[PDB]
């Protein structure tokens, strides 16, 4: 009843007994596996999720079955009966945010899941106040390059009132300007959000690394435009330790990855606006963001500059250029003293996380296709580690775009 | 019908072939086990045999014709007369091609229509097994112009043991347990190296000692056979610009010939049916030479390249891995031995996916095995969603004979 899980480098075997607690269904069936898909898509149903969450909280502090445990279950149950919903205690909100991170199958950085600064913005009332909370988040998390993981959670969804939403997918994003000749200047992943910014009154730039404004949605209001103070947005110019012409490409990336479009679910309550941030793994910038053909797509230009033979695939010019672009990212962030982790250290720490979690909970939900880095996969230990993917709660969840 | 998206181009297909999945994979709505390596009656036979004959005749457009009805009745009588039945040679050919075409973990299936089938179903002993295998290796090697081939030995049946090739491949380098715990040679082959020794093989002591074959005819024990060295084409590994790379003494063999999988066709089972194609360069230069539990040479190369190995963030592992793959591609091309690099191979699999969408509404594919083990996202398959399911005919794993 419990999946056997093998590490093929070491030969070691565990059994994932935690998957038996998966609280929601994924996309696979015995007939076919859809694990490679990007989008795998009241009263006492809310109550059973809430009771489970409270059970998790009281287990974490080693007070299960205590008087305080029972009283809090009764308190939640009575509030759901009266009002159709309930409120988390402050301590429960902190625990639930950390649990949602811990439960995220596609996150390789979960060794850190216990170190998370939780800003409680549940009393936020307007889009202006939203912006203040977000600026305080960026300042705290950036910390002049010594990055600190943080999450700010805005008011929960409730009936009779629209959601708080941040329309941008991240707090810091470069504009992508759609070109009439099909192409794009800037980041192509951000074409749609760029057009929404202009529609709502932003005067666009014409550079490749123009920081986007924020579109902030308060309940039952159209989004409002807010410009980030340039000194809040720490950026790193990209150079290479030995390829001095690299600096002339004029490349740059931003310090702080702050994801703002996912939904945080805790004990059946839903928080549609709860941006979270940590720090980058360098392959995100060096491999995906700069070398994906549908992103900045610089691979061929760098290889030409390296005087590689780009006319035959078998010279492995693509692999050589990509490796140096990753070197440039790592070197440039270290030179600027901005926290970054390379894919070797990050995957080694995840292996330690897996072993911690096997002891602590008897398994760990993990999405192999997302945990293995996009370069050098089998050079990292996670490649050889079998993994079990499943959905626990608290959880970070995809949600529709509010437009 | 699952929706399948390519995230580089934005194109959308629907896999209608998955609905015909013959067996069950390991996944459930509760949890996905797609990353696991091993996904943990006369009526039974007849049902599978009928589906396959129907597959075959539909594929030659003799659909429901008189040749179709007659073959169905022959199978029925043969199983009642004997408990099994015999494939026609054209059905055997079609069945081996389909089993390759259906293999979810094979990135080289663009070639699925081009397969030489050697019918060894009349084989009698391990000596004859050795002859078939030597002919296969000769034909497939073809002086380095590799040609895909499979040899099919007699099916299993009740009352009689099976034919088996005990070696996982026809060409394997010995793995020698050492008195200091380590392994000299290939750690993957420590078990079969000891089995060969146990059955009376004089061991070598090199890192690339080609193993003998342990071949097993029904019910008598296995016999050791030595491969004639001139039959085993090898490629000494050199680097186009790192002159010292040659002196590391690395080599690999030309012909990847997998000999421990079971071929299933129409409910019949062939426990010995060795098949061969040619290598994708990452199999050798990344997995076989750089896996920590294989030859594990990555740090050796990095030291020779004078890389800074005391910090992960110099990406010394990545640079050395790439140059080892460069040396592999260079050495095979120089030796005029067929090889395909991971860029060309994944570009061809994308075309295969497009051809299969038209041919039969989809294609079973195992994303984790299709995406190469270096430079994953530099290849088109990384951005391609895939659906994994089990069709028949098929190649399946099977327990070791011991
Ligand atoms: C502390 C350093 C961290 C590192 C190095 C890290 C690393 C990563 C990486 C490389 C990914 C895959 C992203 C992609 O390919 O698009 C990811 C995904 C994810 N991370 Fe982490 N992470 C960190 C912290 C955090 C924190 C603080 C949270 C939340 C509190 C978090 C939650 C998530 C979630 C929910 C995903 C899945 C996102 C998706 O499916 O799009 N991570 N992480
Ligand atoms: C002709 C050139 C071919 C290329 C370039 C190629 C490439 C590959 C690669 C790279 C793998 C992954 C193997 C691993 O990582 O261990 C694989 C798997 C596989 N191939 Fe192909 N292959 C070729 C021909 C063939 C042929 C002729 C057959 C059978 C008739 C075949 C059947 C299979 C099967 C069944 C697997 C799955 C193996 C497993 O699960 O262990 N392939 N192929
Ligand atoms: N591709 C699309 N959307 C899309 C869908 C699913 C997934 C993605 C991938 C986008 N992950 C962004 C992301 C999520 C989590 C972590 C990090 N990174 C970190 N280090 C970090 C951040 C915070 C703490 O740590 C980056 C994108 C799309 C839709 C329409 C057109 O394109
Ligand atoms: N060794 C083990 N693990 C393991 C288990 C299952 C599978 C594997 C992976 C081993 N595929 C070998 C293989 C299979 C198919 C294709 C190729 N390559 C080609 N190009 C080729 C050959 C013919 C035509 O083309 C290589 C490894 C094991 C089992 C028990 C203890 O350890
Ligand atoms: C189709 C495939 O699932 C898709 O390209 C995935 C694969 N693995 C990934 N892994 C990470 N970390 N990030 C991604 O965007 C993806 N993309
Ligand atoms: C655990 C994981 O399934 C295992 O390491 C897989 C991953 N992908 C692979 N992909 C290929 N082509 N060959 C392999 O042996 C593997 N091994
Ligand atoms: Ca209250
Ligand atoms: Cl990003
Ligand atoms: Cl191999
Ligand atoms: Gd230089
Ligand atoms: Gd030297
Ligand atoms: Gd060392
Ligand atoms: Zn699955």
UniProtKB/Swiss-Prot annotation, chain B:
> Per UniProt, where does heme b bind?
106, 397
Chain intervals for the UniProt region annotation (Interaction with NOSIP):
31-402
* Summary of the tissues where the protein is detected: Platelets, placenta, liver and kidney.
Write out the residues that bind (6R)-L-erythro-5,6,7,8-tetrahydrobiopterin: 35, 287, 368-369, 382
Amino-acid positions noted as binding L-arginine in the UniProt annotation, renumbered to this chain? 169, 278-279, 283, 288
**Where in the cell is the protein located?**
Cell membrane; Membrane, Caveola; Cytoplasm, Cytoskeleton; Golgi apparatus
Q: How does it assemble?
A: Homodimer. Interacts with NOSIP and NOSTRIN. Interacts with HSP90AB1. Forms a complex with ASL, ASS1 and SLC7A1; the complex regulates cell-autonomous L-arginine synthesis and citrulline recycling while channeling extracellular L-arginine to nitric oxide synthesis pathway.
Record function comment: Produces nitric oxide (NO) which is implicated in vascular smooth muscle relaxation through a cGMP-mediated signal transduction pathway. NO mediates vascular endothelial growth factor (VEGF)-induced angiogenesis in coronary vessels and promotes blood clotting through the activation of platelets.
Q: Which family does it belong to?
A: Belongs to the NOS family.
Could you identify this protein by its name? Nitric oxide synthase 3
Which organism was this protein described from?
Answer: Homo sapiens
Organism phylogeny: Eukaryota, Metazoa, Chordata, Craniata, Vertebrata
Residues represented out of the complete protein: 68 to 480 of 1203
């Amino acid at each position: 009843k419990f999946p056997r899980v093998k590490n093929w480098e070491v030969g070691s075997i565990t059994y994932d007994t935690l998957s038996a607690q998966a609280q929601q269904d994924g996309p696979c069936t015995p007939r076919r596996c859809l694990g490679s898909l990007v989008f795998p898509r009241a009263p006492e149903q809310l109550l059973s999720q809430a009771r489970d969450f409270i059970n998790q909280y009281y287990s974490s502090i080693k007070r299960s079955g205590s008087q305080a445990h029972e009283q809090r279950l009764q308190e939640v149950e009575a509030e759901v009966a009266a009002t159709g919903t309930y409120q988390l205690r402050e301590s429960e909100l902190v625990f639930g945010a950390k649990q949602a991170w811990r439960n995220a199958p596609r996150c390789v950085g979960r060794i850190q899941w216990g170190k998370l600064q939780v800003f409680d913005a549940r009393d936020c009332r307007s889009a202006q106040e939203m912006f203040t909370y977000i600026c305080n988040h960026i300042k705290y998390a950036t910390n002049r390059g010594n990055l600190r993981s943080a999450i700010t959670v805005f008011p929960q969804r409730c009936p009779g009132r629209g959601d708080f939403r941040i329309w941008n997918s991240q707090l810091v994003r470069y504009a992508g300007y759609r070109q009439q000749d099909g192409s794009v200047r800037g980041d192509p992943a951000n074409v749609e959000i760029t057009e929404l910014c202009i529609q709502h009154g932003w005067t666009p730039g014409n550079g490749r690394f123009d920081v986007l404004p924020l579109l902030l949605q308060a309940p039952d209001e159209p989004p409002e435009l807010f410009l980030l103070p340039p000194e809040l947005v720490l950026e790193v110019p990209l150079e290479h330790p030995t390829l001095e012409w690299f600096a002339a490409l004029g490349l740059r990336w931003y310090a702080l990855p702050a994801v703002s479009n996912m939904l945080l679910e805790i004990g059946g309550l839903e928080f549609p606006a709860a941006p979270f941030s940590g720090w980058y793994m360098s392959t995100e910038i060096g491999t995906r963001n700069l070398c994906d053909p549908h992103r900045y797509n610089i691979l061929e230009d760098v290889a030409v500059c390296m005087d590689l033979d780009t006319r035959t695939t078998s010279s492995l010019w693509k692999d050589k250029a990509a490796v140096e672009i990753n070197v440039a990212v790592l070197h440039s962030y270290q030179l600027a003293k901005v926290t970054i982790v390379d894919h070797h250290a990050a995957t080694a720490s995840f292996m330690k996380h897996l072993e911690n979690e096997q002891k602590a909970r008897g398994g760990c939900p993990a999405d192999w296709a997302w945990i293995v880095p996009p370069i050098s996969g089998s050079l990292t230990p996670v490649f050889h580690q079998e993994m079990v993917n499943y959905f626990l709660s608290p959880a970070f969840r995809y949600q529709p775009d509010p437009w």
